[PDB]
Amino acid sequence: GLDFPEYDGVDRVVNVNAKNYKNVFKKYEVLALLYHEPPEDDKASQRQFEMDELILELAAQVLEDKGVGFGMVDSEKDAAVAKKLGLTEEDSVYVFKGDEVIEYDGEFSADTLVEFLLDVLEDPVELIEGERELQAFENIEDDNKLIGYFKNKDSEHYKAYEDAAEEFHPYIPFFATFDSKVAKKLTLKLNEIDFYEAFMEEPVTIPDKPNSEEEIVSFVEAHKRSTLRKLKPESMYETWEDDLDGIHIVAFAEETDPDGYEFLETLKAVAQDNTDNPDLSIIWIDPDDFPLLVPYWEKTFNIDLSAPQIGVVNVTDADSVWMEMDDEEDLPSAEELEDWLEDVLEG
Amino acid sequence: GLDFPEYDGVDRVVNVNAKNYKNVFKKYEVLALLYHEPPEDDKASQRQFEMDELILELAAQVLEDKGVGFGMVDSEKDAAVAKKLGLTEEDSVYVFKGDEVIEYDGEFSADTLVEFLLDVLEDPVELIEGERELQAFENIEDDNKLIGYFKNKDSEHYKAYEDAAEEFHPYIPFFATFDSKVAKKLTLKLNEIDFYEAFMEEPVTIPDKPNSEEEIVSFVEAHKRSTLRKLKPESMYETWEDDLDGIHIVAFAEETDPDGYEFLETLKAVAQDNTDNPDLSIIWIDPDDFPLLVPYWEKTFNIDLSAPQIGVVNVTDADSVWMEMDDEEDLPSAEELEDWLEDVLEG
Ligand SMILES: [Ca+2]
Ligand SMILES: [Ca+2]
Ligand SMILES: [Ca+2]
Ligand SMILES: [Ca+2]
Ligand SMILES: [Ca+2]
Ligand SMILES: [Ca+2]
Ligand SMILES: [Ca+2]
Ligand SMILES: [Ca+2]
Ligand SMILES: [Ca+2]
Ligand SMILES: [Ca+2]
C-alpha cells in the first residue's frame, strides 16, 4: 500500500550568491531567503544551523509545486547580495513577492512557514460577493480587518485600497465589495472603509473619504496594536517585542476549553471597556497553539496551563506575577480582572 | 529583552548500545527509542536520517525537565540490543513506560511526539470527582472512551480496570468514578463499565460484570474501530493501514468552518445510522490538523480543501473518486451521502 508523503532528502534550498541571485528572483513567484551569519565551529552552533536549513528544505519540498522558492544568503560570503536586497536583520527570513518585501518575525518552523507562505501567495484583497463570504468576514475576530465599498475594480479608490492592502499582506486581511446590498448591511457609503479592531464589535471608519493609499496605511499603522491581541506563531516575535513600558499583560486561555472560553469572553469584555486606552494591550496566548512551549511556560511562570491564567510579565528578566484563581469558584469577572491589574501595575 | 526559548544544539539523544542500554532505562520514567537502519551513503538518505535525529533532539530538549529520555538503536551495530527490547519494525519509534511498550505509529514530528509523550506520562485512569470533570468526560467525542463505577481504588475490579487501561494508554482514555452520584447520572451499576464509541451518543455496556482485565481488553479490541474515526497525527499510520478490502471512505471537513461543521454533523448522523455495520469505517480528516499535506491532497485528489469533501480511496494506488457538491446549493443530506456511497461501492 502506498504510504503518506515523506521528506525525500533532495536539496531544494538555493545557495544564493552574486552570480545566481538575479535568476532566482525571476524563477519564483514568492521567494523566502534566510539571511544568516556563518555558522561557528562548535558542534552546538553547527546543529542549530543544521536544524534551520532542514526546516527550510522541508518547506521547500511541500511548496515546490506552488512556485515558492527558498534560498540562503551568507552575511560574509554573499555580503554584496545582502546589500542590494536590503537584508539587515541577522539570522532572519525575508519574503519577497513582486514589489513587496516582508521581514518575517514569526516562528521558524515548517508548519508556520508553509501556512504563512500559502497566505502570501493569495491576492491581497478578498472580494465579498456571496452570503457565505459575508458571514466568513463577520466571523473573523482574532485579526484586525478592513472592509471597503467601491464602484468596481476600476475605481481609483479601489486601486488605492488595493495598494494599501499589499503593505500589510497577509497579516491584516483587506476585504472589498462592489455590491450595494452588502454595503447596505455593513452600513458602508461608497468609498467608505471600516476598520474592525480584533475582538471589537464596533468598527471605526477611516475619516475623510475617499482615502488615498497613504491615508489608509497611516490609519492602519495607528490602529493595528489592538487592546486585546492574540499571540500568533506567524508574528509571535513582533508581538512580544512590542511591549509598552517593558511589561506585557499576558492571558492564557484554551479556546476549546469551557473555562478557557468563558475567560476569553471576559478578556474581550475588559478589552471592549478599555478599547481607547492606549496604555493597554493584553496578549492572549492559547497554549494549544504552542505545544512545545507549554512545559517551559509552566516551569518559568509556575502555573498550570490546563486552567486560565492572567499575569504581568517584565520583558527584561521574565519576572512575572500571576493572579490567584480558585478552581472551586467561578472565574473572575471583568471588574475583578481590572481591579487586580490596577493593583499590580500601581506597584 | 529576554527572547523565546530556542533549540540549543546540545546533544541529548543517547546512542543506545550493548554497554549502556541497561542504565538508560533506569534513568528515564519514559523512554523513546528510534530503531533505525544504518543510513545509506547517498546524500539524500543522509539528509533523511539527519532530519529524524534533529526532530528527536528538539523533543529531547523540550522534555528534558519532564524526565523523558530519547535514544537511537542501530539495527546492525546494536542488533543485540534490539532483540532483547523487541525492536522489530524497521525505522520506527518504540516508547517504554514501566512494564508497557508502545510501537508508535504516528507522525514523526516534534509537536506530535512531545504531545504524545506528555500524554504517556499521565496516569492511565482519570478519576471523575467534580462537575467540571464530568462535563469534560461527556464532551469527549473524537476518542473512544470508557467509564466504570467502582467502590474505591482498592476494589479488585478497579485494579483490573486499571490494568486494562494501561494496555491502550494513551490512545483510549479510561475514566472511573467512586461517587454514587456520578454513577447515578451515568446510569452505571457498581462494577459496570460503559464503552462510548467515538462520535456515538449511546454507550455499550461491557457484558458479564464484574469484568476481568482480559474481558475488558478483548471487548475494547473488538470495538476500537469506530464507524466514524478521525485521522489523528499521533496514530495516522495505524488508521490508514487499517483498511477494509483495500479502500477507505475519506471525508475532509474543517471543524471550525461553518460548512465543515455542518458536514461533520451529517457524517456523525450517517455513522450513527450505520453504527453496527462492520463493513463501514469512515475516516474524517480535518485539513487544519495536517497543514503540510494540504497541497499534496489537493493535487493528488484534485479537490479544494476549503470546502467539505467525501470520497473513496484505493489504498494500493491512491486512485480515488470524490462526490461532486455545488457550493451554491445546500450540502448533501445523510441520505444523499449514503446513496452516493452505495453507488460508488457497488461498482
Ligand atoms: Ca548563499
Ligand atoms: Ca492572515
Ligand atoms: Ca457606517
Ligand atoms: Ca481623503
Ligand atoms: Ca482599542
Ligand atoms: Ca545506537
Ligand atoms: Ca489520548
Ligand atoms: Ca446504564
Ligand atoms: Ca465477568
Ligand atoms: Ca459502530
Residue numbers in the entry:
A (entry chain A), B (entry chain A): 3 to 349
Question: What's in the article?
Answer:
Calsequestrin (Casq) is considered to be the major Ca2+-storage/buffer protein within the sarcoplasmic reticulum (SR) of both cardiac and skeletal muscle, where it resides as either its cardiac (Casq2) or skeletal (Casq1) isoform. Casq binds Ca2+ with a capacity roughly equivalent to a half of its total negative charge and an overall dissociation constant of ~1 mM. When studied in solution, Casq polymerizes as free Ca2+ concentrations increase and depolymerizes as Ca2+ concentrations decrease. We also showed that both glycosylation and phosphorylation alter the physical characteristics of Casq substantially, including its oligomerization and Ca2+-binding capacity.
To investigate any structural significance/role of glycans or structural change due to the presence of glycans, the crystal structures for both native and recombinant bovine Casq1, which correspond to the glycosylated and nonglycosylated form, respectively, were determined under the same condition. Calsequestrin crystallized in two forms: the low-Ca2+ forms of native and recombinant bovine Casq1 crystallized in the absence of added Ca2+ in the crystallization buffer; the high-Ca2+ forms crystallized in the presence of 2.5 mM Ca2+ (17× molar excess of Ca2+ added to solution). Low-Ca2+ native bovine Casq1 crystallized in the P1 space group and contained four molecules in the unit cell; the resolution of its diffraction data was 2.74 Å, whereas low-Ca2+ recombinant bovine Casq1 crystallized in the C2221 space group and contained one molecule in the asymmetric unit, with a resolution of 1.88 Å. The lattice packing for both low-Ca2+ native and recombinant established a typical weakly-interacting linear polymer with D2 symmetry, a pattern also found in previous Casq structures. Each monomer in the low-Ca2+ structures of both native and recombinant Casq1 contained five Ca2+ ions, while the three monomers in the high-Ca2+ asymmetric units contained a total of 38 Ca2+ ions. Superposition of low-Ca2+ recombinant Casq1 onto the four low-Ca2+ native monomers in the P1 unit cell had an average r.m.s.d of 0.40 Å.
